[PDB]
Amino acid sequence: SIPKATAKRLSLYYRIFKRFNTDGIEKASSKQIADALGIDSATVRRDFSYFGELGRRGFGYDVKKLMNFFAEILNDHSTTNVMLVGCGNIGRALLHYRFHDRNKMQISMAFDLDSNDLVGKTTEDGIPVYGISTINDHLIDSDIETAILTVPSTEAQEVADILVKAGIKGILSFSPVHLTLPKDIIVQYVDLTSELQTLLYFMNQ
Amino acid sequence: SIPKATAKRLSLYYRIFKRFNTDGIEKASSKQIADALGIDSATVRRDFSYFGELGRRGFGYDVKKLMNFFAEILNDHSTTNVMLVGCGNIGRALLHYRFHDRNKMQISMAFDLDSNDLVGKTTEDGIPVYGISTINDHLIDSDIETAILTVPSTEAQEVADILVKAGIKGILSFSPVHLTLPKDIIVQYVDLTSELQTLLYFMNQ
DNA sequence: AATTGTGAAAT
DNA sequence: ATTTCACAAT
DNA sequence: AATTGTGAAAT
DNA sequence: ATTTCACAAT
Ligand SMILES: NC(=O)c1ccc[n+]([C@@H]2O[C@H](COP(=O)([O-])OP(=O)(O)OC[C@H]3O[C@@H](n4cnc5c(N)ncnc54)[C@H](O)[C@@H]3O)[C@@H](O)[C@H]2O)c1
Ligand SMILES: NC(=O)c1ccc[n+]([C@@H]2O[C@H](COP(=O)([O-])OP(=O)(O)OC[C@H]3O[C@@H](n4cnc5c(N)ncnc54)[C@H](O)[C@@H]3O)[C@@H](O)[C@H]2O)c1
Ligand SMILES: [Mg+2]
Ligand SMILES: [Mg+2]
């Protein structure tokens, strides 16, 4: 919430309260939440307590009340449109994933080089693909200010600048390259090679 | 190294020293490394100092000496064979990524349901795909004890147990589901929806 | 009413 | 900065 | 030889 | 537990 460590769990808590809600479970204790998340229960309680007093003593937490509270925190009572740039290996994995079946996000358009064979067409799921040179045109009346960036590493900086210039305010980047961009622009990195190589480091200790 | 925070950066440092080495840069200061990584230089120095005294005062760090030192720490003077289970959206993104062009890892085989149409064939890059029921057979003389797990969430636990039973010691899992497995088995999670939704949380604060 | 919310300690 | 302990409050 | 390695403080 | 300060050592 305030604390970065807690803010990184919010999405994990929301999923769990949703899963309980689907499974017909109406109450959950912080021990049950801790165990489904693989963390300690004291962190769940300290996490929730930044948002006020959400449980009751001796009972636990009302699953629906918490599912809905977290949806509000996560802005999941409104729809967020995202774009994806770079329709290549990971690009396409994401494009075909129905984010919107579980949360109120969706990739509503994608971009690639103007010469890509997918430009001018749609995804099997109806997501239109356009040339990167037209980004300014399509960004009008999309409500998009968030980009998924899945272009080659050597092009990440150059394409990040195009996105920012064109109005993008937040980037999830799969390139392992620190983007130099103004500090108001939020950048979250996913680094798959580093994740795999770090797994191997832990296995060898 | 000892400290978890530092161990999670090792892979990031290795890449940077490799990149410098490719770019013909022979020396690097902790400020230059900090700036390419987007962190503070005091953490770079404190990070490196867990491994001893790797630089020299007034100079910085010898890029080749550090590239090679990190390759040793990361076990990158030997080849690690990985398997991938679940040849679906993210599965395939990974299968087509040449991990071995940059590090000494490779996905040397994959698995899917026995009825999948890819079973019995190879990847465009020569990676053979087999039925999950044959996992014990193929795990013989592969040197594989690491799995990438990219099956649906509802099947993650059931397939994680098959992998462990069959000899797998480390799992990188893309399912957002805490796997319950013995504590000697190292599990690293990647959670793409939570990463995207957390980006959006940061953008709205 | 069996489990929360939170100071204080530990890391 | 973050986790975990530990217990009076309900 | 301009920058490291590290106690001490801050978080 | 982790980061960042800040400075004597080279
Ligand atoms: N695929 C993986 O599993 C994997 C693994 C580790 C890291 N990564 C990283 O993720 C990034 C992308 O990976 P990938 O394998 O999907 O790469 P890819 O080459 O398969 O996809 C890149 C896409 O971006 C497009 N592109 C290039 N320049 C562009 C531009 N100026 N504007 C718009 N689009 C442009 C390309 O045409 C291509 O479709 C890389 O930084 C890579 O290092 C991917
Ligand atoms: N694709 C994405 O961008 C994305 C985004 C967010 C989360 N995820 C998560 O990653 C996981 C996989 O995603 P996906 O979209 O690639 O799913 P997918 O359904 O596209 O792929 C799953 C694959 O696993 C195979 N499979 C099923 N049971 C199996 C078994 N018992 N043994 C071996 N293989 C089996 C399926 O045949 C299929 O090929 C899910 O947990 C999903 O929530 C993916
Ligand atoms: Mg990489
Ligand atoms: Mg998910």
Residue numbers in the entry:
A (entry chain A), B (entry chain A): 6 to 210
From the paper:
In many Gram-positive bacteria, the redox-sensing transcriptional repressor Rex controls central carbon and energy metabolism by sensing the intra cellular balance between the reduced and oxidized forms of nicotinamide adenine dinucleotide; the NADH/NAD+ ratio. Here, we report high-resolution crystal structures and characterization of a Rex ortholog (Gbs1167) in the opportunistic pathogen, Streptococcus agalactiae, also known as group B streptococcus (GBS). Rex is a homodimer consisting of two domains, an N-terminal DNA recognition domain and a C-terminal Rossmann-like dinucleotide-binding and dimerization domain.
The asymmetric unit contains a single Rex monomer bound to the corresponding half site of the ROP DNA which is predominantly in B-form, with the Rex dimer and complete ROP site related by crystal symmetry. The combined DNA-binding region of the Rex homodimer presents a striking electropositive surface that complements the bound DNA. Each Rex monomer makes a large number of phosphate and base contacts, allowing for high affinity DNA binding. The DNA-binding specificity of Rex is mediated by residues from both its wing and its helix-turn-helix regions. The recognition helices (α3) of the winged helix-turn-helix motifs of the Rex dimer bind two consecutive major grooves of the ROP. Base-specific interactions involve Arg50 and Arg51 of helix α3. Ala47 makes water-mediated contacts with the bases (T6 and C16) of the major groove.
